Amino acid sequence: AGPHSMRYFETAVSRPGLGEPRYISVGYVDNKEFVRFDSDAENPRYEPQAPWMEQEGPEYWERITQIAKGQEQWFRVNLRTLLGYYNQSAGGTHTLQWMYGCDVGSDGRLLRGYEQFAYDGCDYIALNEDLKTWTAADMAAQITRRKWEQAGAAEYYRAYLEGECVEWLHRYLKNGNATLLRTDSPKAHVTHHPRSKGEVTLRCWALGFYPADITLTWQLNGEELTQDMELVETRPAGDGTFQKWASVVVPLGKEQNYTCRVYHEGLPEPLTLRWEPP
């Protein structure tokens, strides 16, 4: 499916008059949630979201929880700062999101790094792929950009990304590689539904697969068909696996010319299947 990855998704929502902003931080290794912090918890701390993370000791959790407190500060402060830059009223709810992390290649070194920020769901500022320059969406962001160029922030982030992000990722991989490097091939099947005069709908189902990376396509006479193919978003079954389907509209009596292709890394060979009556 690709290079290994560690990613953090952090978000803060201001709630004026209802207390502190709500702060949530979620960590993912290979797109699997493994760590989570919520500020509205009874004992706000980082908790494992994966069984292989209970292999970590006491000092780990307390340390990263401290980091969480510092981050809460940062978020509240800069929420207010952005209220400033955008000239907004102080009794509104607003969101500030931070996404960051590392994709590493087969050698174990930094392949790609991420540092991006959104305000009210819209891009604010993002570290370019050079890991040296900033893309600022608008005028309010240019302030932060000049400020951060002046301060040499890009080098700080690049140093974190090339350094400890990768080392942590390596560590985690080493602990959870039994469950992370596992595949569940999809069970595929085709359903048939009347649709209109002379027209039927064929639906290719891929169920119970892990990881979520999958390709479903149709085929008219052995040739790829995606034109007016309806694809739903890959969805969680809730038990760790995923589902997806792809549909086409087909002339009644011609269903035998159509095939569904399922590509998944769990399969030794791609699946090719058709509507099998009765």
Partner: peptide, 9 residues
């Protein structure tokens, strides 16, 4: 492990 923004807006 998560980390700090450190720098302010």
């Amino acid at each position: 492990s998560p980390s700090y923004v450190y720098h302010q807006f």
